[PDB]
Structure 1
Amino acid sequence: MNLEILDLSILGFYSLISSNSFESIAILVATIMPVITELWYNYSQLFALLYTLIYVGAVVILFVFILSVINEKEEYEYEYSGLFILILVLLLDDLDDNESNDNDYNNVYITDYADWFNNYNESDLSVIGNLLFTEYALLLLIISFILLMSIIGLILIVKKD
């Protein structure tokens, strides 16, 4: 039983019924956690950890803004929905989870063959840094330039002075 399917089923239910802004900042965290875990267990543990290191800091800053802008509006308001229309919507959605229509690509299993030629064996992050700091160093230096612009941009927007 792939229990990640159940997790996304609950998350989709709570995204349809979410009312206030605090629930939305919880839908975000309830989305990154399935992403981080599935990356950890299937494809990339490096990027599972990079997601946690960067998105959490963004989440708390996002949460602190909710405190300064919460404006009483959706606590006392009413929503109608209907339990039957919610579950029927989620049932129809769950029916079609085939993002791709290449049946052979989705059904036939493949393998790779290992070789011993790579005797200098290092992590993916060392190769990523090796290329990023040598061949795509321009991409890194532009990213540094964009980060500098954000620093100036945030000040010229928020600072009253």
Structure 2
Amino acid sequence: MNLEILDLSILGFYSLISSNSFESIAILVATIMPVITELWYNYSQLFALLYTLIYVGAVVILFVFILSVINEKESGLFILILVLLLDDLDDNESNDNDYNNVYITDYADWFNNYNESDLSVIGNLLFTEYALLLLIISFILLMSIIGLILIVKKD
């Protein structure tokens, strides 16, 4: 019972009916959590935690920070369920049937006696191979610090 479907159906139900900005910020948190949880299992535990640390901890609480600043002011059940059911029918993102119905494996090998985490390799390449990508990023971060202050600061 792949319950990850039911979490998004609830999420897809409330995205069609949200009115104020409180619910709009709720759709953000209600979308990262399935993204984090479906990354924790299956694909990548490292990027599930990076998402929590960087999205939830950094960019999500900034939204609610400015919503309290901006303002707080101010459909039919048949059409919604009809739309959600129609949205529910066709969920095959790709049309390679064999690629979606046939399973595969990999073979492990013992040639790698220096076993270290992925974040070890990513740092190994980001700080050596693609040190230009890393250095431009600190340059993009630098422009934001200047960019934020020029936009917002009054005097």
| Contact 1:29–1:59 under 8 Å retained in 2 | no
Q: CA deviation at 1:60?
A: 4.6
- Measured at CA, do residues 59 and 134 of structure 1 come closer, stay the same or move farther in structure 2, by a change above 3 Å? closer
- Aligned CA-pair RMSD: 1.8
- Measured at CA, do residues 91 and 101 of structure 1 come closer, stay the same or move farther in structure 2, by a change above 3 Å? same
3-state SS of paired residue (2:108): coil
Q: CA deviation at 1:66?
A: 4.1
| Contact 1:19–1:74 under 8 Å retained in 2 | no
| Contact 1:13–1:90 under 8 Å retained in 2 | yes
Q: Which residue of 2 aligns with 1:90?
A: 84
List per-residue Cα deviations over 1:4-60 (Å, max 9, x = no partner).
000000000000010000101110000000000000001000000000001113345
3-state SS of paired residue (2:91): coil
CA distance in 2, matches of 1:133, 1:72: 45
| Contact 1:18–1:24 under 8 Å retained in 2 | yes
Normalised to the residue count of structure 2, the TM-score between the two structures is 0.94
- Measured at CA, do residues 12 and 25 of structure 1 come closer, stay the same or move farther in structure 2, by a change above 3 Å? same
List per-residue Cα deviations over 1:56-82 (Å, max 9, x = no partner).
13345434444444534339xxxxxx0
Give unpaired runs (5+ residues) of structure 1: 76-81
| Contact 2:36–2:52 under 8 Å retained in 1 | yes
| Contact 2:7–2:34 under 8 Å retained in 1 | yes
| Contact 2:39–2:47 under 8 Å retained in 1 | yes
| Contact 1:21–1:66 under 8 Å retained in 2 | no
Q: What is the identity percentage for the equivalent residue pairs of Structure 1 and Structure 2?
A: 99
| Contact 1:132–1:140 under 8 Å retained in 2 | yes
* Alignment length (residue pairs): 155
3-state SS of paired residue (1:110): coil
Q: Which residue of 2 aligns with 1:148?
A: 142
Give unpaired runs (5+ residues) of structure 2: none
List per-residue Cα deviations over 1:98-145 (Å, max 9, x = no partner).
000000000000000000000000000000000000000000000000
CA distance in 2, matches of 1:64, 1:92: 33
Q: Which residue of 2 aligns with 1:53?
A: 53
CA distance in 2, matches of 1:65, 1:100: 39
CA distance in 2, matches of 1:154, 1:54: 19
Normalised to the residue count of structure 1, the TM-score between the two structures is 0.91
